[PDB]
Design a protein around this ligand. Structure first.
Ligand code: CA
Ligand code: CA
Ligand code: CA
Ligand code: CA
Lengths: 89, 146, 89, 146
């Protein structure tokens, strides 16, 4: 039987979170790049502002990913419990 | 993503583990109860998401054929050697790859659901390969998962 | 300055969860092993019972680990926000 | 785990980002407000845990010297190339490594905080190296992170 083996691993709201956060990663990556590499004169207040927005977007995508890993393990928990019924007779 | 006859039957028994009132459907409420009985704590939104992933007709609950699809997509299993070794590591106080027979008894007779001092005797008889009063838990786990 | 870089990654209740769950991993690994490899006659009801307990313990440890990853990224979020003040002048 | 003078000073400014009422301490409530302003949603227990990790005197709040220790332990940074590439990948509809100039404009002028169609023009001028109306986003991200 399955002995000690377990299910092998690996939403609308979460998806919405993703497109908006990912667009802002693009936005802020571009604006940091522009303001640090494409200007004659670096405006540090501007860079700070876009660094805050950049980290917020990146960390939002991390949060989504972590939640999907959590959801996936919850689903695998349900499947593992179901699979205990495969142990017969 | 294909299932046999006897497995479809055994999964019907499984469905009853979830469908507590036997009304033919699993609700978020029933899923919450089961998940908590396993020592997890899914939020409302997480319960709804688990139902939604396999809720093919969008009626908000899981029926038996939906339940079989969740299964068919994840029949694949994998060995648990590393995760089991990590669980033993928790008790490896000095990080040296060993847990003494004395310390194993102390863990197993006090923590979690527990083993009796006698069940502990059978476990240590198997685990202490060298008869040195020490358990190389990497090796013991490899033996049990071979 | 730091441009697009971010903080490099990698509790009592959570710790308690860990020792109890880890002890039960040991418990149920042993009891599954015994009942599937060390008996003359496999009692499948027994194996099923210990498989349920085994998966519950393993998944409890996964839950703790995921929560620690979440906590760690939250802390790294605080540090990243703080580090925007390093962008001067 | 060592910090300079000017960094200690800049981190005092940082402390003010968190200590909203300027009373010299960061509470779970203040931390919640800041974390949510960043689009996160830590639970009560998570807010308490973040305070507890660095709450050396156990008074339930973070003071400035505690705040500096959290920092000293994590001054190390790492490049974000892969995470940024993954964010572009979200918009790579056909999974071919490209996003067209038209599709980039459509994303950037509708989604998130947005760029103006004009800011989009500057971004595409840089991104479309070959002048083919297509953005190899792996390459563009490698350029920006070099
Ligand atoms: Ca029901
Ligand atoms: Ca349904
Ligand atoms: Ca305050
Ligand atoms: Ca304190």
């Amino acid at each position: 039987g399955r002995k000690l083996e377990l299910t092998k691993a690996e939403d609308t709201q979460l998806t919405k979170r993703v497109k908006n956060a990912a667009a802002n990663v693009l936005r802020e990556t571009w604006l940091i790049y522009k303001n640090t590499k494409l200007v004659k004169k670096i405006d540090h207040a501007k860079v700070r502002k876009h660094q805050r927005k950049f980290l917020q977007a990146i960390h939002q995508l991390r949060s989504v990913k972590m939640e999907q890993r959590k959801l996936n393990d919850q689903a695998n928990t349900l499947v593992d419990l179901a699979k205990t019924q495969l142990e017969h007779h | 993503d294909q299932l046999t006859e006897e497995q479809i039957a055994e999964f019907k028994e499984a469905f009853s583990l979830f469908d507590k009132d036997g009304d033919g459907t699993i609700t978020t409420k029933e899923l919450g109860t089961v998940m908590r009985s396993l020592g997890q704590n899914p939020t409302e939104a997480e319960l709804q998401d688990m139902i939604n992933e396999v809720d093919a007709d969008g009626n908000g609950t899981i029926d038996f054929p939906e339940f079989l699809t969740m299964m068919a997509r994840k029949m694949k299993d994998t060995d648990s050697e590393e995760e089991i070794r990590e669980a033993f590591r928790v008790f490896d106080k000095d990080g040296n790859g060993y847990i003494s027979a004395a310390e194993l008894r102390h863990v197993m007779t006090n923590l979690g659901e527990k083993l009796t001092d006698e069940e502990v005797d059978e476990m240590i008889r198997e685990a202490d390969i060298d008869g040195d009063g020490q358990v190389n838990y990497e090796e013991f786990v490899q033996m049990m998962t071979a």
